[PDB]
Design a binder for these strands. Structure first.
Length: 95
RNA sequence: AUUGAAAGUUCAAAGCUUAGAUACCCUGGAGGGAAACCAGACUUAACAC
């Protein structure tokens, strides 16, 4: 709905895998997968949330419950994610 | 011991005849096959030393 932020990142020796477990295939090349960025963002978010909850309450919550709590930003089966990721790899034309 | 006595409102007779539940009439309007999801995890064994 509106661009929130924009991050020019840089990965060194990425080993991104596609359907053939490689960054390239007979049909396209894909060095960065937005689905992997989203999944790793959620994984790190759960790690960080248990970190917090343990540095204050000494309690640790299941991943189910953490993502159920964050389902307003990351979405779930009951709600569409509020954040939309858009990778733009420069030179990312047909290869 | 009467303006009385006596006297079957009875007989024959088809609620029948003609007549179209028909005429006009859009199952249509509104409605995203979407939402969520890491192609990833990790080296081990053997003998020599």
């Amino acid at each position: 709905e509106e661009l929130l932020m924009s991050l020019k990142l840089k990965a060194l020796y990425p080993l991104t895998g596609g359907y053939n477990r490689h960054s390239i295939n007979p049909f396209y090349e894909e060095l960065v997968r937005p689905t992997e960025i989203k999944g790793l963002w959620r994984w790190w978010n759960r790690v960080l949330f248990n970190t917090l909850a343990y540095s204050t309450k000494g309690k640790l919550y299941t991943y189910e419950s953490i993502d159920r709590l964050f389902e307003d930003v990351f979405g779930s089966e009951n709600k569409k994610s509020a954040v939309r990721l858009e990778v733009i790899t420069d030179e990312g034309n047909d290869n």
